[PDB]
């Protein structure tokens, strides 16, 4: 069928340099077929395929710019604890160097036997010097979500570290628990995703109508639209959401849907972008490759892979400015004149601090719609 | 919409459209606690060329609420500063 190609295989089997024969040509062309289709694919070879079927860091890595990177170090995990920020890129792990490593062969190296010391070394954007982090693996514990009073505010912060399989029961139950709220900081920054059931689940805890994501391929029968059920308690209370680059996958499903139905203001940092899905497919006989086989799109059709969600409001971080710098004159001074979320923790958030000021616009806006 | 921003230069007739503002929600106050004039002036001339400046009452905005001495507290409080 493929006529060209063996011409190709023809050539280097005949003028190439070092003698090689078709088990590897064929290989490299496995190999490099799928390394020229996505970044997320790799081809499992027979005696690869069966390693391949026989606590952690607390490290999600992903792809980008074609070279493995740290999305996101989930919250309270030894590796956040250690210091490893989103974004780094993971040159070495123990012995190995990853700049030709698949993404699973770098987590079946780091999560193992708990209380077990991990070397990786990373670079930066910020630094010259290549980072050194020696880590212990850890039996992995998260209290996903936590809401605390904002005070001075009407308003509650919730705070979503990674979706595992009790967030949105945890919301809804935090919500009921404040019934005056009026409003809500969605924080899920730093965030890297999880279950795409609890993406759902949690966007279909705001939104009443419509589809919330969609899972696309090229065959159409495959096709699955996720849609809200009409179960959506909170349909009107202000929700303001915070992203940055380490909110990914079920995070930014849950921003891109309330963006999209214009439930919610996006606030922050464009995102990692990671919407895709991967599978193994069993090749030949005993092989295996592992290709994307669909992407997720947001109700309005935007694709979350290599583009993300772009806030409504971008806000880097940073302190909120100074208290004030002025011994300033009022009329109160002339002559004869006429007569748990504390401000120490937002004045240090400016992401946080205009995640409130956009709930007190909305509020504002809610009030004159009388 | 309309948002209005106040500092601690904006007194007398911008605290009044500030206020009137803010009293009806028809647009959000942003910055910082303003002066705090919270009186009507009125000049009367003596002179061919001279005049008296008196203060001649105290004005109140549509709530009621007076702003002498206090200023307004705006709805969203910032200070200046380089983003």
Same mark, same amino acid.
């Given at each position: 069928?493929?006529?060209?190609?063996?011409?190709?295989?023809?050539?280097?089997?005949?003028?190439?340099?070092?003698?090689?024969?078709?088990?590897?040509?064929?290989?490299?062309? *496995?190999?490099?077929?799928?390394?020229?289709?996505?970044?997320?694919?790799?081809?499992?070879?027979?005696?690869?395929?069966?390693?391949?079927?026989?606590?952690?860091? @607390?490290?999600?890595?992903?792809?980008?710019? /074609?070279?493995?990177?740290?999305?996101?170090?989930?919250?309270?995990?030894?590796?956040?604890?250690?210091?490893?920020?989103? @974004?780094?890129?993971?040159?070495?792990?123990?012995?190995?160097?990853?700049?030709?490593?698949?993404?699973?062969?770098?987590? !079946?190296?780091?999560?193992?036997?708990?209380?077990?010391? +991990?070397?990786?070394?990373?670079?930066?954007?910020?630094?010259?010097?290549?980072?050194?982090? !020696?880590?212990? #693996?850890?039996?992995?514990? =998260?209290?996903?979500?936590?809401?605390?009073?904002?005070?001075?505010?009407? %308003?509650?912060?919730?705070?979503?570290?990674?979706?595992?399989?009790?967030?949105?029961?945890?919301?809804?139950?935090?919500?009921?628990?404040?019934?005056?709220?009026?409003?809500?900081?969605?924080?899920?920054?730093?965030?890297? /995703?999880?279950?795409?059931?609890?993406?759902?689940?949690?966007?279909?805890?705001?939104?009443?109508?419509?589809?919330?994501?969609?899972?696309? /391929?090229?065959?159409?029968?495959?096709?699955?639209?996720?849609?809200?059920? /009409?179960?959506?308690? %909170?349909?009107?209370?202000?929700?303001?959401?915070?992203?940055?680059?380490?909110?990914?996958?079920?995070?930014?499903?849950?921003?891109?849907?309330?963006?999209?139905?214009?439930?919610?203001?996006?606030?922050?940092?464009?995102?990692?972008?990671?919407?895709?899905?991967?599978?193994?497919?069993?090749?030949?006989?005993?092989?295996? +490759?592992?290709?994307?086989?669909? #992407?997720? %799109? =947001?109700?309005?059709?935007?694709?979350?892979?290599?583009?993300?969600?772009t806030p409504d409001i971008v806000i880097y971080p940073g302190?909120?400015?100074?208290?004030?710098?002025?011994?300033?004159? $009022?009329?109160?001074?002339?002559?004869?004149?006429?007569?748990?979320?504390?401000?120490?923790?937002?004045?240090?958030? *400016?992401?946080?601090?205009?995640?409130?000021?956009?709930? $007190?616009?909305?509020?504002?806006?809610?009030?004159?719609?009388?």
């Amino acid at each position: 069928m493929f006529s060209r190609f063996s011409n190709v295989v023809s050539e280097i089997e005949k003028k190439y340099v070092d003698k090689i024969s078709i088990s590897e040509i064929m290989t490299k062309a *496995i190999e490099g077929l799928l390394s020229n289709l996505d970044a997320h694919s790799a081809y499992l070879n027979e005696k690869k395929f069966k390693e391949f079927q026989a606590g952690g860091l @607390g490290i999600t890595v992903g792809m980008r710019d /074609g070279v493995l990177t740290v999305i996101a170090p989930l919250e309270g995990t030894p590796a956040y604890k250690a210091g490893v920020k989103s @974004g780094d890129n993971i040159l070495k792990i123990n012995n190995e160097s990853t700049l030709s490593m698949s993404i699973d062969d770098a987590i !079946n190296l780091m999560r193992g036997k708990p209380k077990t010391p +991990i070397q990786i070394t990373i670079v930066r954007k910020n630094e010259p010097k290549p980072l050194v982090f !020696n880590i212990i #693996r850890d039996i992995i514990k =998260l209290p996903s979500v936590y809401v605390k009073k904002i005070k001075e505010t009407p %308003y509650l912060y919730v705070r979503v570290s990674g979706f595992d399989k009790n967030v949105t029961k945890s919301v809804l139950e935090g919500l009921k628990a404040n019934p005056k709220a009026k409003g809500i900081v969605l924080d899920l920054r730093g965030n890297p /995703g999880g279950l795409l059931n609890q993406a759902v689940g949690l966007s279909n805890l705001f939104i009443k109508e419509g589809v919330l994501v969609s899972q696309k /391929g090229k065959n159409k029968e495959e096709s699955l639209e996720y849609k809200a059920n /009409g179960r959506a308690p %909170y349909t009107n209370l202000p929700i303001a959401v915070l992203v940055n680059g380490g909110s990914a996958s079920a995070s930014e499903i849950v921003a891109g849907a309330l963006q999209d139905h214009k439930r919610a203001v996006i606030i922050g940092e464009k995102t990692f972008g990671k919407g895709s899905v991967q599978m193994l497919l069993p090749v030949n006989k005993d092989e295996a +490759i592992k290709i994307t086989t669909a #992407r997720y %799109y =947001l109700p309005s059709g935007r694709t979350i892979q290599a583009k993300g969600i772009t806030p409504d409001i971008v806000i880097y971080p940073g302190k909120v400015p100074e208290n004030e710098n002025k011994f300033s004159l $009022k009329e109160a001074d002339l002559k004869h004149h006429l007569e748990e979320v504390t401000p120490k923790m937002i004045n240090d958030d *400016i992401q946080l601090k205009t995640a409130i000021d956009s709930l $007190k616009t909305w509020s504002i806006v809610d009030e004159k719609m009388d």
